[PDB]
């Protein structure tokens, strides 16, 4: 994995030794080269994972998350270079250093063979994200946002640490490859009940679980654009990755420990999607849509069938691309009208038609239009939850109504109707902005041609 | 009830608006032109009977039961003119009504495609920015203390001045752009 | 389709509809004939005149605007303003 870790670290002298006019160009270029390099992780086998060393491995779960992570860094640099144009040069380099450091922590979060090293990289991701939100977020509430993001995580993750160390004392190892063969069944007891909660609640916070989700519509809203891109696209998926690894050790107790959380997710995706119908802040609407989409990934991981894991990893990759694009579109309107109020700037298709086409494609992927990988993940989770219980289709199908309703309402409010008369600073779309939208949307649509690389380890 | 200049509707205005609504709904009920023409003369005869009514309480009572008469006898789908609110072509062309300020954001290669148009646009912009301070100081020397009472704007009073707040009335888009 | 309106055409059609009205003699009518002060018409007659203008040109004049059109020239100027004639 060290052929990816070392160039990601070499981005640090690359950004700190660059000429002052070259720090976006150089980091964008070489992060795109690292992202091109990331496709060598697609040496996956039908039986074995790609096991590099004692410290690092990559199966078909971690590989698309790695490719998406390494792809998101150039797009974050493109998204962030405009609103940091007037910034001090050293603070600009510190911002890029926090993004590079976050990429470095993420790529060895997903490839960590041993679970306590997964824990340390998983929690190490908090510090650059907290710094990016509280230092380069725009408003006052970022400070409060930085507290919620910090303290819902750690209150969930410090019982995980203890739990993992307990497994270290019980199994003798936290190697996931060893734990594939030495896993013992976890019977019904109170000790194993709180073992289950300590193993699961940190990832439940990261997803987020409904009812634990309150950090997200502050953290993703108050963040700068690169912060929101990495929070929605990658850091939510640390929870899903960690659940898919940790539920190996939690059988068969999961078969009744999942029942409350499944309810919290199945009703929660009804709630948060409904919340999106009455959001006045566009970026808050995109955040609540992320909570609603990750509720399906929670249900799919908890019912733990092959179809549900395939749907959940497809939905994680698809939601990463779609939610990152939606935050970038909302930012492209924020960088013109300087307000996140969705009803403010209307009729934007009359003024910005190609950006309206990007809004259309991102809305269509948000509502899971076939054959997008959004629909592939959505549909496969719906198949597996119908097999779990046939009544879930009600809460599934009603969700797909509301998901359509808030996706097009967002599209109707901002793009359609009459333009606002008094707003006259709607600049034509920059090449950087359309480029950012296309670098989200074109890989997302090309993955429909060959979705087997985003279907995870039990494709 | 809600008017830009007046604070209310007078009794005479309420009677005339009822008369126009009743004739339009009667034309919707009475599709054919001779049949509408007969019943419209009968409705005009009903309006001329209480025309010379001096008791305003009696006239207000007659207006109120005439509104109840209209509400019982209205058409469920009255005729709406196509560009009128509720019509089938209402606000259809608003997607084509691009505001004029977007021409400021054109590239010089596409402004050079229309040299005389933009040369004529720049003297409109020059006229507007030399008229602005005179029309602001016209508004503040003519508005009473406490703010304007009605939403009516004054005309230009001098020879050479433009009417205050004229630009978005004059440079509004066409109805068929 | 949709032939363009001129000021002379709007004026001719407005005076045409008013000459086809039995409470107005067509020899006293001009473009500046006030309906109440020169032609001696009622306010109900003015409402009917504006409704015939609406039926003539195919669009609705609202009541806050219809109550102020008291000569043929004001009607012609209103239809000119609402249809953007002499572009």
């Amino acid at each position: 994995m060290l052929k990816y870790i070392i160039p990601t670290m070499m981005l640090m002298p690359l950004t700190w030794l660059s000429k002052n006019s070259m720090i976006w160009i150089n980091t964008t270029l070489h992060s795109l080269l690292i992202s091109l390099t990331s496709l060598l992780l697609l040496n996956q086998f039908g039986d074995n994972s790609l096991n590099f060393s004692l410290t690092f491995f990559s199966d078909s779960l971690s590989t698309p998350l790695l490719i998406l992570t390494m792809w998101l860094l150039p797009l974050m640099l493109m998204a962030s270079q405009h609103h940091l144009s007037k910034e001090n040069l050293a603070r600009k380099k510190l911002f890029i250093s926090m993004l590079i450091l976050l990429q470095l922590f993420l790529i060895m979060t997903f490839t960590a063979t041993e679970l306590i090293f997964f824990y340390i990289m998983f929690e190490a991701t908090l510090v650059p994200t907290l710094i990016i939100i509280t230092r380069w977020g725009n408003q006052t509430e970022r400070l409060n946002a930085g507290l919620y993001f910090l303290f819902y995580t750690l209150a969930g993750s410090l019982p995980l640490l203890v739990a993992l160390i307990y497994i270290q004392n019980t199994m003798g190892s936290l190697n996931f490859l060893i734990l594939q063969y030495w896993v013992q069944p976890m019977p019904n007891s109170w000790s194993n009940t709180f073992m289950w909660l300590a193993c699961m609640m940190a990832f439940m916070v990261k997803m987020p679980l409904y009812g634990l989700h309150l950090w997200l519509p502050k953290a993703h809203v108050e963040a700068p654009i690169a912060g929101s891109m990495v929070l929605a696209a990658i850091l939510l998926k640390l929870g899903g990755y960690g659940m898919m690894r940790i539920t190996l050790l939690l059988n068969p107790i999961t078969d009744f420990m999942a029942y409350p959380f499944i309810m919290l997710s199945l009703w929660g995706m009804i709630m948060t999607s409904s919340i999106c119908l009455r959001q006045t802040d566009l970026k808050s609407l995109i955040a609540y849509s992320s909570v609603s989409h990750m509720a399906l990934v929670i249900v799919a991981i908890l019912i733990q069938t092959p179809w549900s894991y395939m749907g959940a990893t497809a939905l994680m990759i698809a939601h990463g691309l779609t939610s990152s694009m939606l935050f970038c579109l909302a930012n492209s309107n924020y960088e013109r009208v300087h307000s996140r109020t969705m009803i403010l700037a209307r009729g934007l298709q009359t003024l910005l038609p190609l950006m309206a086409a990007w809004w259309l494609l991102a809305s269509l992927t948000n509502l899971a239009l076939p054959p997008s990988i959004n629909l592939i993940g959505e549909l496969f989770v719906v198949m597996s939850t119908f097999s779990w219980s046939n009544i879930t289709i009600i809460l599934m199908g009603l969700n797909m109504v509301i998901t359509a309703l808030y996706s097009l309402y967002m599209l109707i409010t901002t793009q359609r109707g009459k333009h606002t008369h008094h707003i006259n600073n709607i600049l034509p779309s920059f090449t950087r902005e359309n480029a950012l939208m296309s670098l989200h949307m074109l890989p997302l649509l090309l993955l429909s041609l060959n979705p087997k690389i985003i279907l995870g380890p039990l494709y | 009830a809600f008017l830009p200049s007046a604070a209310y509707l007078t009794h005479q205005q309420k009677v005339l608006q009822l008369y126009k609504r009743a004739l339009r709904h009667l034309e919707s009920r009475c599709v054919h032109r001779d049949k509408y023409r007969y019943f419209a003369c009968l409705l005009r005869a009903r309006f001329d009977e209480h025309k010379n009514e001096k008791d305003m309480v009696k006239a207000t009572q007659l207006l109120r039961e005439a509104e109840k008469e209209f509400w019982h006898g209205q058409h469920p789908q009255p005729y709406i003119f196509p560009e009128s609110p509720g019509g089938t072509s209402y606000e259809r062309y608003e997607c084509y009504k691009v505001p004029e300020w977007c021409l400021d954001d054109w590239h010089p290669s596409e402004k050079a495609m229309y040299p005389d148009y933009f040369a004529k646009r720049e003297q409109w912009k020059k006229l507007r920015r030399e008229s602005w301070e005179r029309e602001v100081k016209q508004l503040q020397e003519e508005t009473p203390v406490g703010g304007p009472r009605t939403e009516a704007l004054p005309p230009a009073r001098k020879q050479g001045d433009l009417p205050p707040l004229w630009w978005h009335i004059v440079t509004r888009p066409r109805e068929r752009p | 389709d949709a032939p363009p309106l001129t000021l002379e055409g709007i004026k001719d059609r407005v005076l045409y509809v008013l000459k086809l009205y039995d409470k107005i003699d067509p020899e006293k009518l001009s473009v500046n004939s006030h309906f109440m002060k020169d032609l001696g018409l009622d306010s109900l007659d003015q409402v009917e005149i504006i409704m015939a203008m609406e039926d003539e040109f195919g669009f609705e004049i609202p009541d806050i605007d219809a109550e102020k059109l008291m000569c043929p020239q004001e009607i012609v100027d209103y239809i000119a303003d609402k249809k953007d004639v002499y572009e």
Binding site: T350, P353 | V98, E110, Y114 | P4, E87
Partner: peptide
């Protein structure tokens, strides 16, 4: 005859 300018946003970019 009587061709009218169509106001539209900038399609260059």
């Amino acid at each position: 005859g009587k061709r009218l300018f169509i106001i539209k946003p900038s399609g260059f970019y």
